[PDB]
Amino acid sequence: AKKERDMDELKKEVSMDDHKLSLDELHRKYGTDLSRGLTPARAAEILARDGPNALTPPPTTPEWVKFCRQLFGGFSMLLWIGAILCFLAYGIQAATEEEPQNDNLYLGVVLSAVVIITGCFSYYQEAKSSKIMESFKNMVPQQALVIRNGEKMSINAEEVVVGDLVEVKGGDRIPADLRIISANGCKVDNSSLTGESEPQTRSPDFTNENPLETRNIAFFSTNCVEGTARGIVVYTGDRTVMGRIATLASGLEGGQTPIAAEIEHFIHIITGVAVFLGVSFFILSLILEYTWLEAVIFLIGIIVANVPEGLLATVTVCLTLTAKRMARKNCLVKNLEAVETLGSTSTICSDKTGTLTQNRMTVAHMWSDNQIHEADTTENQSGVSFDKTSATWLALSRIAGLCNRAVFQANQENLPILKRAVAGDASESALLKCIELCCGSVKEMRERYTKIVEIPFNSTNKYQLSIHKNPNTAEPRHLLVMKGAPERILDRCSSILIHGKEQPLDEELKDAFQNAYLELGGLGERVLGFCHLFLPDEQFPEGFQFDTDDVNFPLDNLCFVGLISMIDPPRAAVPDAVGKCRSAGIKVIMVTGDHPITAKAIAKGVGIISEGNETVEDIAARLNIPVSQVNPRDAKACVVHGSDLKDMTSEQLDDILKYHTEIVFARTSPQQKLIIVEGCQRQGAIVAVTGDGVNDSPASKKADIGVAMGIAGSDVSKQAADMILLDDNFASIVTGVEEGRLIFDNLKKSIAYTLTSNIPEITPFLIFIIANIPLPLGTVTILCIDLGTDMVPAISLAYEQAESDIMKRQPRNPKTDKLVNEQLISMAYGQIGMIQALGGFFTYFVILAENGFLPIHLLGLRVNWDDRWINDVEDSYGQQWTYEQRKIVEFTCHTPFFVTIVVVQWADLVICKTRRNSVFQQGMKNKILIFGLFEETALAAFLSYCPGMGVALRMYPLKPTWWFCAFPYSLLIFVYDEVRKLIIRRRPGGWVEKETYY
């Protein structure tokens, strides 16, 4: 156990084995007998030395820490020290001229609260409860079958040891890693590994260099679909192959989303101002020497006026909306932060099987009547049939259905034909369904023609056949139907049924049949041959005892009915909705542990390899020239084999990505998918990963955002993903990548509008030091902007439609073009922010002169004004005001600074609405943002007229004339912004845009 770049890097190289040993090359090596196992004594005794079989999950940092590590989120230092200085200060005042004032002490508890509350909000965000191993550990079994001394005995799977004798039977799961010594008729669901669920065969036939491919290694997690085997255990739990993955996956730092590393960037800027200011005006506070607590009371101000409060959780909420919004398009989001992620994305890596496709072997074409037909490879049956007009079909249907051991599972007439549980395999059932679906029932069509004898598929002869009592009223009685390999089902045919009428199997058709077997399977399809014979009436009368030991009936000159072909096909949306991700400028890449011949064919099918585009190989054979002779940069697309990845270097790879557009990594380790993601990532790009298979986890969990599939996929894949397409619709990746480009804009608007109102909050406290003026805007007054009036109106932009075909622009670029930037701050702070203050002061200047203190006779007062004894202070007339007498006007000055601010925010909330369109181009269809207005505004009122807000908040009722102050200023703000956008739209490369277009 070394560093991570080791303990976790070794978990990344593919493994190496001992299926190449002889049977006596083992024996020694484990000491295990073989006619008869281990001792049971050297068993539990290998247990101690080597230690229990099964995996142990990473520890869990509880719901303490997971929380508090939040209570320091950027603005949360500033917001924390403001409420500490508050608890200071107050103390100071509980020591001098009796000030049992509620004042500051409340600001301490108040502020502190907000810092907490603010954290949750940004915690129900950075959530991530990722129970992965409590998914893998579920694929080992309760008990396992091993033998000892000779006894065969099942036992707790964890009592298997690196050495003993295991007998896997049919259906059940594979306890450890097996090297198969005995073995029988043993096929095995290698899905957890390959990704496909078609059974492979297990023999002791060492066959192959690579331990993933030899038929003499059995694998942890996998299950024995049929047969039986015996094995010596070469790897025990944590130490195995799948286990060495559950490790590598449940071992992966989620890491910064692409969003949360925007928050952790404007924060760095804000906080900046929030100190630079805050300490510029504090050494200078006491360089003119206000008290001590006349500066630490002025920090508490300058802080608060700087930390945006009602934002970092305004943003948490913008997310939680568009999140809970897609979940109605049936796409579930397990990680809020992720609701953004999909949008910022420039590369997708997709598992083919089950994700891109339906993982349902299925009939793609046919060869009735010399013509090639095509059928509906969808899940719902969008497109068209193919025919039946011809009799030839009634005939081929008959064969394909009649000669077939597939039933349906009990109790299933409910579901759609296709989604019904078969009891067959790959082809057989793929054919069963083809028929049942479009040729009436088969539970029926197989009692009409009752089978009298049959010959199941034997590897030697590559054919399968049944003789059936055709029941016609005429009626040769005895229909022989057979299918099998095609090229080897003409050497058994002499005639070719056409539209209804037999004919000679001449040379025209023999060439054109081979002319279609190529075309057809060049589409990466399994192709079958179907043929029948009406058994001469005389030669076999009603009773004939057909035999299947001694052959007995004809096998030649049989009639040839037609070819049928299957495939694992895209799902409906997949193709239309992949080319979508390219109007969006996203790169798609196939990452599949299937075989290259299917891959590239399915690739071209969905559209990851576009028309008229070639690879090297594709070329050599279009110029009959050896390959190492083709200029590799001539090739846009390429298919790469997981067995060349094995020996490649990141760099040859960074080159394979840097230089090709249409890529297909085929047959790939689990590790290997990650090994690719990691290298797409390598150079900046944000990457998504689609999957369904436990074989995926690792990428589905290194993914910038990882998408699983809902019903296909596995406890794992998903429990290791961010999104989870509940309806398995692979178009919700386009929907999602749009909805996520919009939450971006609508998060800039949502922020701007928050930040803009920050400027007419700092400058008051800023002049309070400059022109020793009576404090216009008070602290407790500021926690009414972003916590009160401003919340709702901000939340409201998140609901803002677009301004163009967003899914028509290249994907944003993590490094450049940030969420918050120069051109934006230059606007909420440098521009609209000032104008908001010129209007906010202007009325403080009116509240006071309309009340006496003509502006200038203000440039000093504070020093005296704030004095609780100097009850006798000249205004601008002579009038002498007490303390509470004049303060009740100071607070009356807050109270409608706090408004000219809300009044200006109208004009704001309406130009932080759009960033290019005039408001007459986009209109005000935001039936929520409007609400924010009516609320915002009226809130203020209430906050100013209720019998109480005065004694509670320094909020005093206002006089009609009072509200309309900021008005010219709101309306300026408004007209300034409108004229910006124009310019831009008239000169889109010109100076203005460079400077105001966020």
Partner: peptide
Amino acid sequence: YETVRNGGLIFAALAFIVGLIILLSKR
């Protein structure tokens, strides 16, 4: 002043309400 306090409580309350009617306008 008594005539101003009962003055703002109205055009305010007819704004938490018109807002609910613009809100429940399709939700």
